Amino acid sequence: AIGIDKINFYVPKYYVDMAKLAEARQVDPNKFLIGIGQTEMAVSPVNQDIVSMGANAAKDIITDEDKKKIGMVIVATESAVDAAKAAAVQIHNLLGIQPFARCFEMKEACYAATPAIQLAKDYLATRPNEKVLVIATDTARYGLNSGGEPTQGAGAVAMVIAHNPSILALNEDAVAYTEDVYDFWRPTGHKYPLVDGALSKDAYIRSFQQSWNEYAKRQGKSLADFASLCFHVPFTKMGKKALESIIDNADETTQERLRSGYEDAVDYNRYVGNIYTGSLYLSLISLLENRDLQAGETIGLFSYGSGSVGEFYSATLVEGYKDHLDQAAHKALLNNRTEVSVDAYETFFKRFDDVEFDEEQDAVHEDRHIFYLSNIENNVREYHRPELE
Amino acid sequence: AIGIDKINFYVPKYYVDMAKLAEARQVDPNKFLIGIGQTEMAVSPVNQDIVSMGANAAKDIITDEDKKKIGMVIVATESAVDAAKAAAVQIHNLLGIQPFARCFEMKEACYAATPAIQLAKDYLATRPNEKVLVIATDTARYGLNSGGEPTQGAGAVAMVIAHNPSILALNEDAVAYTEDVYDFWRPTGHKYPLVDGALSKDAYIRSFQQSWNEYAKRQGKSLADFASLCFHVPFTKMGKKALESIIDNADETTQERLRSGYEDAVDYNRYVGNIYTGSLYLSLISLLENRDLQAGETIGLFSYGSGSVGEFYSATLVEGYKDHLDQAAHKALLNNRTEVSVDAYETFFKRFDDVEFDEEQDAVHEDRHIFYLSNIENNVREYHRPELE
Numbered sequence: 198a199i200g201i202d203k204i205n206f207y208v209p210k211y212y213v214d215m216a217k218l219a220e221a222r223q224v225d226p227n228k229f230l231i232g233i234g235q236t237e238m239a240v241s242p243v244n245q246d247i248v249s250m251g252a253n254a255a256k257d258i259i260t261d262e263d264k265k266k267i268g269m270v271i272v273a274t275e276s277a278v279d280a281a282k283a284a285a286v287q288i289h290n291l292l293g294i295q296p297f298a299r300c301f302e303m304k305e306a307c308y309a310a311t312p313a314i315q316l317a318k319d320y321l322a323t324r325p326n327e328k329v330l331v332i333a334t335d336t337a338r339y340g341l342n343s344g345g346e347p348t349q350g351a352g353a354v355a356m357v358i359a360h361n362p363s364i365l366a367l368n369e370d371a372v373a374y375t376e377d378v379y380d381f382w383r384p385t386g387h388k389y390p391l392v393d394g395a396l397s398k399d400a401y402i403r404s405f406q407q408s409w410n411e412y413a414k415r416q417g418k419s420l421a422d423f424a425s426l427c428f429h430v431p432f433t434k435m436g437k438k439a440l441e442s443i444i445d446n447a448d449e450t451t452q453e454r455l456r457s458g459y460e461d462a463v464d465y466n467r468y469v470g471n472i473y474t475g476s477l478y479l480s481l482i483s484l485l486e487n488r489d490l491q492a493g494e495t496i497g498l499f500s501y502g503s504g505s506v507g508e509f510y511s512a513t514l515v516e517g518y519k520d521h522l523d524q525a526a527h528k529a530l531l532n533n534r535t536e537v538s539v540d541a542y543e544t545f546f547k548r549f550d551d552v553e554f555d556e557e558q559d560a561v562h563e564d565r566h567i568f569y570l571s572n573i574e575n576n577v578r579e580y581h582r583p584e585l586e
Numbered sequence: 587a588i589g590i591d592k593i594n595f596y597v598p599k600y601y602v603d604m605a606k607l608a609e610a611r612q613v614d615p616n617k618f619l620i621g622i623g624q625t626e627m628a629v630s631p632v633n634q635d636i637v638s639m640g641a642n643a644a645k646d647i648i649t650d651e652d653k654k655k656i657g658m659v660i661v662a663t664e665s666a667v668d669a670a671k672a673a674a675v676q677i678h679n680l681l682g683i684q685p686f687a688r689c690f691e692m693k694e695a696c697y698a699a700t701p702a703i704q705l706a707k708d709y710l711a712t713r714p715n716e717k718v719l720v721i722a723t724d725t726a727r728y729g730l731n732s733g734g735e736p737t738q739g740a741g742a743v744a745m746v747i748a749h750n751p752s753i754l755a756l757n758e759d760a761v762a763y764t765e766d767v768y769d770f771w772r773p774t775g776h777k778y779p780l781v782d783g784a785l786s787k788d789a790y791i792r793s794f795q796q797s798w799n800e801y802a803k804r805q806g807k808s809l810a811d812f813a814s815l816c817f818h819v820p821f822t823k824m825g826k827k828a829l830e831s832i833i834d835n836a837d838e839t840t841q842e843r844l845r846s847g848y849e850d851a852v853d854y855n856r857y858v859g860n861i862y863t864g865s866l867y868l869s870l871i872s873l874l875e876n877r878d879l880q881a882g883e884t885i886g887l888f889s890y891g892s893g894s895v896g897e898f899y900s901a902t903l904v905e906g907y908k909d910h911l912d913q914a915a916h917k918a919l920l921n922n923r924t925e926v927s928v929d930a931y932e933t934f935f936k937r938f939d940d941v942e943f944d945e946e947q948d949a950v951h952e953d954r955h956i957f958y959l960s961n962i963e964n965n966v967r968e969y970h971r972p973e974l975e
């Protein structure tokens with residue numbers, strides 16, 4: 198079998214409380230806490246870009262041996278910093294991976310990490326001793342006082358795909374569905390995306406229904422065959438709606454199971470926000486660590502990308518997977534963050550726009566053990582490397 | 587076997603004479619004609635963006651049946667018009683391909699089309715009744731009076747990867763090489779790339795030598811085993827230098843053959859210019875149509891992307907391939923172009939920057955049989971479809 202052998206995520210060291218944001222936006226806190234279903238929003242300091250967040254997510258899961266066996270490094274993102282040079286090249290360099298490897302970026306809104314791991318699996322079919330590093334990294338920025346502001350987030354998820362995976366085996370049953378729609382897009386030149394709220398909800402649910410129907414038809418499967426479903430989520434309230442529209446015809450035993458699985462799947466996302474390409478895989482991490490699924494059981498995953506493309510596929514938990522997760526490290530990562538006021542968040546937000554460095558405000562002295570953007574000279578980004586190196 | 591079943595290209599209807607450009611830039615025409623090795627530069631009218639050029643290259647090689655069997659549409663480019671929505675979705679829509687397919691963009695400077703076709707092959711290994719559509723589309727724009735201006739170009743190449751290919755079977759011998767270098771890049775916000783001419787040449791040649799060396803070592807092969815080599819062409823003279831750097835240690839018979847093959851390979855490129863991700867594949871088309879290679883003979887290909895990543899692989903000619911090429915249509919495509927003066931070229935260029943439509947200057951009435959950008963309303967691009975539809 199081939200699948201996810203290692204998985205880990207990284208989010209910046211700051212966050213803003215959703216109830217506080219609500220107060221500053223003149224709305225009932227519950228609108229955010231319950232309406233959209235978010236509790237804390239990740240805030241990006243200027244010294245963390247998609248390159249440093251991606252490297253930080255991958256550094257803890259690649260060993261010296263892995264550095265010699267990784268044949269491809271794929272970065273999925275819709276928050277690129279260069280129009281030509283793939284961020285995968287910089288991360289390949291920063292992580293010290295062997296030179297004979299392919300590095301490139303994949304793009305299609307928040308759907309990109311899925312074809313990356315699926316194709317990584319296909320690439321590995323004939324290479325039992327090779328591995329593939331896939332990194333989903335993004336900064337969901339809508340703008341201050343914008344309609345999507347409450348759903349903002351930032352982070353990166355790193356996955357090592359290989360034979361004899363310790364966590365999840367990817368099955369060969371994926372089915373995608375493409376339909377040209379303008380629910381969310383960001384033309385060249387625009388700092389923030391153009392959104393069509395109401396329309397983005399309909400497109401999202403339709404893509405899911407269409408992909409699931411085709412999948413169920415081709416595999417002769419039904420919801421009852423899944424221990425749990427894991428979806429892409431712009432915010433937890435949106436994911437709940439998509440689930441309810443599909444399990445509307447499932448048995449009661451199945452509905453209780455899938456509804457319960459969902460809450461475990463979006464646990465971590467409630468404290469980070471939308472991280473685009475990484476949202477589905479952060480939810481996957483949450484599900485695996487917060488729920489106690491049994492080995493051999495199957496999970497159904499739905500990946501979505503505005504524009505739009507949807508894909509439904511399944512994976513199977515591998516025996517002993519619990520021993521290969523980093524639950525303590527993950528809870529620690531989220532708990533070790535510092536809450537910032539809304540005014541502070543707004544200052545960070547404005548500085549990120551212009552990439553205005555400030556060693557004091559980002560408190561870089563505390564980041565000795567991680568990768569971070571230290572400066573830009575002659576249009577070249579310079580990164581600080583973990584002290585351990 | 588799996589490989590290229592069909593391949594076609596499209597360049598815009600205008601071009602500027604290199605000798606004319608030289609005179610306008612106050613330099614010896616031979617500097618451009620012999621020095622860099624370019625005769626005509628493709629000029630982009632505003633009604634041709636990467637989506638329409640890509641659709642125009644694929645339309646002539648997609649049959650009704652193909653539309654039903656294409657399960658993946660991959661667009662390689664470094665000239666994207668949206669930071670989130672993959673241009674593959676628009677092309678998928680324009681070409682009328684069946685809904686159950688994956689659509690996404692791949693990026694890594696001019697290297698992207700290669701991992702696209704290599705992964706498309708790995709993807710098809712277990713899907714016998716499916717095909718993949720790969721489209722490399724770009725507009726190489728450096729800026730009026732810039733250092734790279736003479737090497738500008740625009741166009742797209744479309745390839746259908748399938749089982750039992752009619753033209754080329756892709757072998758399982760690819761080896762890539764990555765090395766972080768700032769020879770050419772374009773930070774977000776920059777209209778034109780930042781280049782380091784001198785450095786970019788050495789980076790190119792080093793990547794080729796490192797890739798070739800590892801490939802020769804792994805496959806136990808030598809240049810003498812190739813009927814011809816085909817490489818990425820920023821401009822024909824650059825490819826000549828790279829080739830000369832390695833055939834030095836080759837027999838007289840092999841040097842004559844590879845030098846001769848090179849001239850055939852860059853024939854079409856002399857009249858188009860650099861088209862980034864599509865350059866290598868345009869050269870491949872040129873080689874196959876202008877030379878008379880025999881079935882079973884092997885071609886060695888070198889793909890390069892600044893940043894940088896290089897890959898060397900081989901493919902074998904399929905018996906009867908000549909009957910599956912479109913030399914007549916290609917010669918006609920290049921011949922039916924209209925030369926524009928340097929003044930007109932500069933007007934077209936400046937208009938392209940701001941996407942300022944001009945039905946008369948772009949002469950859209952002549953474009954009834956092709957796809958083209960007809961307008962942009964509310965940040966949404968509208969395209970005209972061939973009348974035959």
Ligand SMILES: CC(=O)CC(=O)SCCNC(=O)CCNC(=O)[C@H](O)C(C)(C)COP(=O)(O)OP(=O)(O)OC[C@H]1O[C@@H](n2cnc3c(N)ncnc32)[C@H](O)[C@@H]1OP(=O)(O)O
Pocket residue numbers: 225227228229231232233307344345346347348381392393394395397398401429430431432434435471473501502503
């Ligand atoms: C972006 C991607 O990554 C791609 C995708 O998945 S597309 C998914 C959707 N798109 C996005 O996420 C883009 C950004 N989204 C947006 O534009 C907006 O954030 C949004 C439209 C999703 C919501 O913004 P909004 O309009 O201000 O809130 P609104 O839609 O009015 O509704 C707020 C919710 O809180 C509820 N609510 C209102 N006041 C409340 C209160 N006091 N207490 C509790 N609930 C309350 C409302 O009933 C509503 O829930 P429903 O789903 O039952 O209607």
Ligand SMILES: CC(=O)CC(=O)SCCNC(=O)CCNC(=O)[C@H](O)C(C)(C)COP(=O)(O)OP(=O)(O)OC[C@H]1O[C@@H](n2cnc3c(N)ncnc32)[C@H](O)[C@@H]1OP(=O)(O)O
Pocket residue numbers: 614615616617618620621622696733734735736737769770781782783784786787790818819820821823824860862890891892
């Ligand atoms: C961009 C990608 O897609 C990635 C790659 O492949 S990177 C590899 C190539 N890089 C690029 O294309 C980047 C963009 N290009 C550039 O920066 C520039 O166009 C360039 C550096 C390639 C050349 O620009 P230039 O400086 O104006 O021309 P210059 O370097 O002076 O030399 C012109 C050539 O014509 C020759 N020449 C000069 N006058 C001549 C004359 N009257 N008659 C004939 N030959 C003449 C020169 O000797 C020279 O040839 P060689 O050096 O190879 O012997």
